[PDB]
């Protein structure tokens, strides 16, 4: 990884949802659901047999 | 910045220049710059192999 | 939670419970579980293997 960047959600100033969404993100992250759904939506074909 | 939306979920940089003007939360994922390439066929010049 | 000060600039995992009771800055060093293992036993010499 040459560089490091992060996708985060945008909102104007003073939004009450900043913190309520941070906690939600942390819990869902600990749920690993993000991981599996990332796998699914980034799955595609898979590797064929090539040996 | 004019509130013409609400919480925006989309590929969106976390940048200083944007954080100065818009508010962000804990990243749900992390990016990266990495190379892209096609795996070699395996063939090599007739001089090097022997 | 008390007020000795505002800061603790240390490796401190931003967990669900910790954000419940602590406001956190944005991450600076992302961390993950990996594994550690030995490279080849590699017990071969060029002196007598011939
Ligand atoms: C692989 O083969 C293609 C033709 O099938 C050729 O154009 C290409 O240069 C080759 N690349 C490598 C890395 O062998």
Curated annotation (Swiss-Prot), chains B, C:
Tissue note: Highest expression is found in the olfactory lobe, piriform cortex, dentate gyrus, hippocampus, granular cell layer of the cerebellum, and in caudate-putamen.
Q: Which domain of life is it from?
A: Eukaryota
User: Where found?
Assistant: Cell membrane; Postsynaptic cell membrane
How is this chain modified after translation? Sumoylation mediates kainate receptor-mediated endocytosis and regulates synaptic transmission. Sumoylation is enhanced by PIAS3 and desumoylated by SENP1.
Q: Which residues bind L-glutamate?
A: 11, 13, 18
According to the record, which residues are glycosylated? 41
Quaternary structure and interacting proteins, as annotated: Homotetramer and heterotetramer with GRIK5. Tetramers may be formed by the dimerization of dimers. Assembles into a kainate-gated homomeric channel that does not bind AMPA. Can form functional heteromeric receptors with GRIK4 and GRIK5. Can form functional heteromeric receptors with GRIK3. Interacts with DLG4. Interacts with NETO2. Interacts (via C-terminus) with KLHL17 (via kelch repeats); the interaction targets GRIK2 for degradation via ubiquitin-proteasome pathway.
The record's misc note reads: The postsynaptic actions of Glu are mediated by a variety of receptors that are named according to their selective agonists. This receptor binds domoate > kainate > quisqualate > glutamate. It does not bind AMPA without coexpression with GRIK5.
Primary role: Ionotropic glutamate receptor that functions as a cation-permeable ligand-gated ion channel, gated by L-glutamate and the glutamatergic agonist kainic acid. L-glutamate acts as an excitatory neurotransmitter at many synapses in the central nervous system. Binding of the excitatory neurotransmitter L-glutamate induces a conformation change, leading to the opening of the cation channel, and thereby converts the chemical signal to an electrical impulse. The receptor then desensitizes rapidly and enters a transient inactive state, characterized by the presence of bound agonist. Independent of its ionotropic glutamate receptor activity, acts as a thermoreceptor conferring sensitivity to cold temperatures. Functions in dorsal root ganglion neurons.
Member of which family?
Answer: Belongs to the glutamate-gated ion channel (TC 1.A.10.1) family. GRIK2 subfamily.
| Entry protein name | Glutamate receptor ionotropic, kainate 2
What organism does the record attribute this protein to?
Rattus norvegicus (Rat)
């Amino acid at each position: 990884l040459i560089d490091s960047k992060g996708y985060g959600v945008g909102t104007p100033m003073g939004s009450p949802y900043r913190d309520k969404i941070t906690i939600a993100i942390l819990q869902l992250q600990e749920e690993g659901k993000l991981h599996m759904m990332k796998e699914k939506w980034w799955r595609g074909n898979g590797c064929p047999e090539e040996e | 910045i004019d509130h013409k939306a609400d919480l925006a979920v989309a590929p969106l940089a976390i940048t200083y220049v944007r954080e100065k003007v818009i508010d962000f939360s804990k990243p749900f994922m992390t990016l990266g710059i990495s190379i892209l390439y096609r795996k070699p066929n395996g063939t090599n010049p007739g001089v090097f192999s022997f």
